[PDB]
Every structure is written in C-alpha cells, then in structure tokens.
Amino acid sequence: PHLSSGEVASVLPLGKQLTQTPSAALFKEHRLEVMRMVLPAGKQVGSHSVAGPSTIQCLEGEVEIGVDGAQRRLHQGDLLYLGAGAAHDVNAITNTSLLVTVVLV
Amino acid sequence: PHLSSGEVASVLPLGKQLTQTPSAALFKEHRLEVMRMVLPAGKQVGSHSVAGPSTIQCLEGEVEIGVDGAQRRLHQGDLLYLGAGAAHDVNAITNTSLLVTVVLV
C-alpha cells in the first residue's frame, strides 16, 4: 500500500476517522519518504533530527513543534520547514494528522 | 521572504484571493524547493520533467495532471507522487493552487 510514480493518495483531514487511522507511509523511495503521521491529543515525540531537509504540514488539529529558539504552534494548513539536521520535538495539542516529507541523503 | 529552518508558511486555500495571488516559492535550498503554484482556471503547463522526485498536492480546486499512462484528476487533498524524471503536464480545471515539493539532485 505505497504509491508508485504517477499515483495519488488523499491527505484530506480525517476528522471523526482520525482515532481509527494509524500513521502510514504514502511512499518511500531512495531520495524521499512521505508519511501521514496521526497523533492523538497529548502524544509527544522527543527531540530528534534527520539528515536531510524536511517539511511538516499540519492537515488538521493543532500541534506544537519545538525547534532551535522557538515553539511553533501549527494549525491547519501550516507548513513548517526543517533544514537538514534541525532538531525538533512534537507535542499534539489536539488529535492531529501531519504530512511529513523527508528528503533522504 | 522565503522560509528559513523552523519557519512556517500557511498553505490554506486562497479562496477569493486566489486570482490576486501569484505563484511563489515558500523556500529554495540546496536539496529541496517548495513552491505554491497558483493556476487560474484553464491554465496549462506543457509536458516536462525534473531530475529529482517530486510531489504535487492539490490545495483547492481541481487540476488534471497528465502522467505516463494516465490523466490524474486531482481534487483538494490529493497528493501525487512523481518519480525522478517522470514526464508530466498540468491543466487547471478550476482556479487552483498546488503545493509542489521538488527534491534537487
């Protein structure tokens, strides 16, 4: 259940289905991985980083992403840019779903 | 004012402000470029390819993206994966905005 080139996935908000939907990869290839992370309200991910640059898009709900020098409160439609190796943590304020795109080096 | 690491841009639907908003890069860095393409209804981009893989997310409206072996009709929330060097064309069905993420090789 992964997209190949030319294929499509819907990242619309899950809404009432959020609580029944696990996080899943849309696709993973040599240079890129795209995943939908589903976080229930309160879920935390400790400080960490990835070697390539990445983007986190808040599809619904509210999530706090701690970064060097700030705590970014993302709401629906917010797209956060993380440079290569930029440390960050995640705190789901509400039930939320995130589209996470990671460049692999 | 492109995003630096840890910064946020809204990719919410433009709605009534769509036809007044030009396409713009959210950021451009060594390994990754993220742009919002704003296409008025009927606008076409001819068949072309980029060297790295990419994703095209339909933020609002409807767009037809031609790919090898198919014509994908994307609606809001649809995310298309394009492999490295995958030829594609774009036809805005309605006024639409697209989040385009491109891995740079």
Side-chain angles (χ1 to χ4, degrees), chain A residues 46-65:
Chain A
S47 183
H48 66 287
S49 63
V50 293
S54 61
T55 68
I56 302 172
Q57 188 184 145
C58 178
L59 302 168
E60 67 194 303
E62 179 180 15
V63 63
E64 173 182 286
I65 303 299

mmCIF file of all heavy atoms in Angstrom, chain A residues 46-65:
data_model
loop_
_atom_site.group_PDB
_atom_site.id
_atom_site.type_symbol
_atom_site.label_atom_id
_atom_site.label_comp_id
_atom_site.label_asym_id
_atom_site.label_seq_id
_atom_site.Cartn_x
_atom_site.Cartn_y
_atom_site.Cartn_z
ATOM 1 N N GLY A 46 10.086 12.947 21.301
ATOM 2 C CA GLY A 46 11.259 13.646 21.834
ATOM 3 C C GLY A 46 12.107 14.328 20.772
ATOM 4 O O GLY A 46 11.919 14.116 19.582
ATOM 5 N N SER A 47 13.048 15.139 21.237
ATOM 6 C CA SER A 47 13.951 15.879 20.391
ATOM 7 C C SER A 47 14.743 14.923 19.514
ATOM 8 O O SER A 47 15.350 13.970 20.008
ATOM 9 C CB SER A 47 14.919 16.710 21.232
ATOM 10 O OG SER A 47 15.752 17.492 20.399
ATOM 11 N N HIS A 48 14.701 15.157 18.207
ATOM 12 C CA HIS A 48 15.440 14.333 17.262
ATOM 13 C C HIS A 48 15.597 15.094 15.960
ATOM 14 O O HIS A 48 15.025 16.158 15.806
ATOM 15 C CB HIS A 48 14.682 13.036 16.977
ATOM 16 C CG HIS A 48 13.393 13.264 16.254
ATOM 17 N ND1 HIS A 48 12.291 13.802 16.878
ATOM 18 C CD2 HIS A 48 13.051 13.098 14.954
ATOM 19 C CE1 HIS A 48 11.313 13.937 15.998
ATOM 20 N NE2 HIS A 48 11.749 13.515 14.824
ATOM 21 N N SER A 49 16.377 14.524 15.048
ATOM 22 C CA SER A 49 16.574 15.107 13.727
ATOM 23 C C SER A 49 16.809 14.027 12.676
ATOM 24 O O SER A 49 17.032 12.860 12.989
ATOM 25 C CB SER A 49 17.735 16.119 13.740
ATOM 26 O OG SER A 49 18.976 15.502 14.057
ATOM 27 N N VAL A 50 16.741 14.453 11.427
ATOM 28 C CA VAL A 50 17.002 13.618 10.256
ATOM 29 C C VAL A 50 18.092 14.331 9.432
ATOM 30 O O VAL A 50 18.257 15.572 9.506
ATOM 31 C CB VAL A 50 15.726 13.292 9.461
ATOM 32 C CG1 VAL A 50 14.839 12.386 10.336
ATOM 33 C CG2 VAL A 50 14.984 14.585 8.992
ATOM 34 N N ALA A 51 18.854 13.537 8.684
ATOM 35 C CA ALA A 51 19.996 14.046 7.951
ATOM 36 C C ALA A 51 19.620 14.955 6.799
ATOM 37 O O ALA A 51 20.406 15.798 6.447
ATOM 38 C CB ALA A 51 20.887 12.910 7.459
ATOM 39 N N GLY A 52 18.456 14.764 6.175
ATOM 40 C CA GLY A 52 18.055 15.641 5.087
ATOM 41 C C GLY A 52 17.051 16.684 5.522
ATOM 42 O O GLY A 52 16.518 16.637 6.664
ATOM 43 N N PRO A 53 16.751 17.641 4.604
ATOM 44 C CA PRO A 53 15.742 18.610 4.952
ATOM 45 C C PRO A 53 14.370 17.953 4.934
ATOM 46 O O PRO A 53 14.199 16.878 4.357
ATOM 47 C CB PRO A 53 15.858 19.660 3.848
ATOM 48 C CG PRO A 53 16.316 18.889 2.651
ATOM 49 C CD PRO A 53 17.317 17.896 3.250
ATOM 50 N N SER A 54 13.416 18.591 5.591
ATOM 51 C CA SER A 54 12.066 18.047 5.660
ATOM 52 C C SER A 54 11.028 19.110 5.820
ATOM 53 O O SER A 54 11.350 20.255 6.127
ATOM 54 C CB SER A 54 11.963 17.044 6.829
ATOM 55 O OG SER A 54 12.223 17.631 8.108
ATOM 56 N N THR A 55 9.768 18.720 5.570
ATOM 57 C CA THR A 55 8.617 19.596 5.795
ATOM 58 C C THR A 55 7.569 18.832 6.590
ATOM 59 O O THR A 55 7.401 17.595 6.429
ATOM 60 C CB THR A 55 8.008 20.216 4.510
ATOM 61 O OG1 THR A 55 7.395 19.207 3.704
ATOM 62 C CG2 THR A 55 9.086 21.001 3.682
ATOM 63 N N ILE A 56 6.940 19.550 7.505
ATOM 64 C CA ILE A 56 5.795 19.062 8.265
ATOM 65 C C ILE A 56 4.607 19.976 8.007
ATOM 66 O O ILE A 56 4.666 21.191 8.316
ATOM 67 C CB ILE A 56 6.054 19.061 9.786
ATOM 68 C CG1 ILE A 56 7.280 18.200 10.112
ATOM 69 C CG2 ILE A 56 4.795 18.569 10.530
ATOM 70 C CD1 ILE A 56 7.739 18.307 11.586
ATOM 71 N N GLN A 57 3.527 19.392 7.476
ATOM 72 C CA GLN A 57 2.286 20.087 7.181
ATOM 73 C C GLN A 57 1.208 19.608 8.133
ATOM 74 O O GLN A 57 0.906 18.410 8.187
ATOM 75 C CB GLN A 57 1.845 19.876 5.734
ATOM 76 C CG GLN A 57 0.656 20.736 5.284
ATOM 77 C CD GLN A 57 0.210 20.417 3.868
ATOM 78 O OE1 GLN A 57 -0.984 20.464 3.561
ATOM 79 N NE2 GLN A 57 1.167 20.037 3.006
ATOM 80 N N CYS A 58 0.613 20.550 8.852
ATOM 81 C CA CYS A 58 -0.473 20.259 9.782
ATOM 82 C C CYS A 58 -1.753 20.164 8.952
ATOM 83 O O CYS A 58 -2.228 21.172 8.440
ATOM 84 C CB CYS A 58 -0.600 21.346 10.841
ATOM 85 S SG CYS A 58 -1.970 21.049 11.963
ATOM 86 N N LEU A 59 -2.298 18.957 8.805
ATOM 87 C CA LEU A 59 -3.501 18.749 7.957
ATOM 88 C C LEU A 59 -4.790 19.095 8.694
ATOM 89 O O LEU A 59 -5.820 19.450 8.069
ATOM 90 C CB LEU A 59 -3.565 17.312 7.445
ATOM 91 C CG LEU A 59 -2.363 16.821 6.629
ATOM 92 C CD1 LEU A 59 -2.426 15.316 6.442
ATOM 93 C CD2 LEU A 59 -2.172 17.584 5.316
ATOM 94 N N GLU A 60 -4.767 18.926 10.018
ATOM 95 C CA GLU A 60 -5.911 19.218 10.868
ATOM 96 C C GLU A 60 -5.440 19.250 12.326
ATOM 97 O O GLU A 60 -4.386 18.675 12.645
ATOM 98 C CB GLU A 60 -6.982 18.136 10.683
ATOM 99 C CG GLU A 60 -6.547 16.738 11.207
ATOM 100 C CD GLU A 60 -7.453 15.636 10.733
ATOM 101 O OE1 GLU A 60 -8.661 15.714 11.002
ATOM 102 O OE2 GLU A 60 -6.932 14.679 10.111
ATOM 103 N N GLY A 61 -6.246 19.851 13.196
ATOM 104 C CA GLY A 61 -5.940 19.919 14.608
ATOM 105 C C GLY A 61 -4.855 20.940 14.891
ATOM 106 O O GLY A 61 -4.652 21.888 14.109
ATOM 107 N N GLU A 62 -4.178 20.751 16.015
ATOM 108 C CA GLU A 62 -3.128 21.672 16.470
ATOM 109 C C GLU A 62 -1.966 20.874 17.059
ATOM 110 O O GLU A 62 -2.179 19.963 17.874
ATOM 111 C CB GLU A 62 -3.709 22.633 17.497
ATOM 112 C CG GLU A 62 -2.726 23.649 18.090
ATOM 113 C CD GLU A 62 -3.356 24.582 19.117
ATOM 114 O OE1 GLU A 62 -4.461 24.326 19.620
ATOM 115 O OE2 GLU A 62 -2.727 25.586 19.443
ATOM 116 N N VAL A 63 -0.750 21.235 16.675
ATOM 117 C CA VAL A 63 0.463 20.556 17.117
ATOM 118 C C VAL A 63 1.521 21.613 17.427
ATOM 119 O O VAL A 63 1.618 22.621 16.714
ATOM 120 C CB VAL A 63 1.007 19.584 16.016
ATOM 121 C CG1 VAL A 63 1.414 20.324 14.749
ATOM 122 C CG2 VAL A 63 2.187 18.751 16.523
ATOM 123 N N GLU A 64 2.282 21.392 18.493
ATOM 124 C CA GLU A 64 3.396 22.267 18.821
ATOM 125 C C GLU A 64 4.656 21.529 18.368
ATOM 126 O O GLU A 64 4.847 20.361 18.717
ATOM 127 C CB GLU A 64 3.450 22.529 20.310
ATOM 128 C CG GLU A 64 4.695 23.316 20.763
ATOM 129 C CD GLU A 64 4.700 23.497 22.252
ATOM 130 O OE1 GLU A 64 3.894 24.325 22.704
ATOM 131 O OE2 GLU A 64 5.517 22.818 22.954
ATOM 132 N N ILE A 65 5.493 22.203 17.585
ATOM 133 C CA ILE A 65 6.773 21.661 17.146
ATOM 134 C C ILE A 65 7.858 22.567 17.723
ATOM 135 O O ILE A 65 7.941 23.754 17.358
ATOM 136 C CB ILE A 65 6.933 21.634 15.622
ATOM 137 C CG1 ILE A 65 5.818 20.839 14.924
ATOM 138 C CG2 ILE A 65 8.310 21.066 15.246
ATOM 139 C CD1 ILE A 65 5.755 19.406 15.314
#
